[PDB]
Design a protein that fits this description.
Blueprint (H helix, E strand, L loop, with lengths): L1 H38 L5 H5 L1
Organism: Homo sapiens (Human)
Family: Belongs to the TRAFAC class dynamin-like GTPase superfamily. GB1/RHD3 GTPase family.
Protein name: Guanylate binding protein 1
């Protein structure tokens, strides 16, 4: 019972870390897309201006 409660707690903790990592990746990808829209050679504003 203690081992099952501990395994259930560890599984909950891992699921919480996975969600936090997914959120961080989505945030990082969003930041990269904005940086590309500002300053990527094919698809940017600064290159078009130059």
């Amino acid at each position: 019972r203690v081992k099952a409660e501990s395994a259930q707690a560890s599984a909950k903790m891992l699921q919480e870390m996975q969600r936090k990592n997914e959120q961080m990746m989505e945030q990082k990808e969003r930041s990269y897309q904005e940086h590309l829209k500002q300053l990527t050679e094919k698809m940017e504003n600064d290159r078009v201006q130059l």
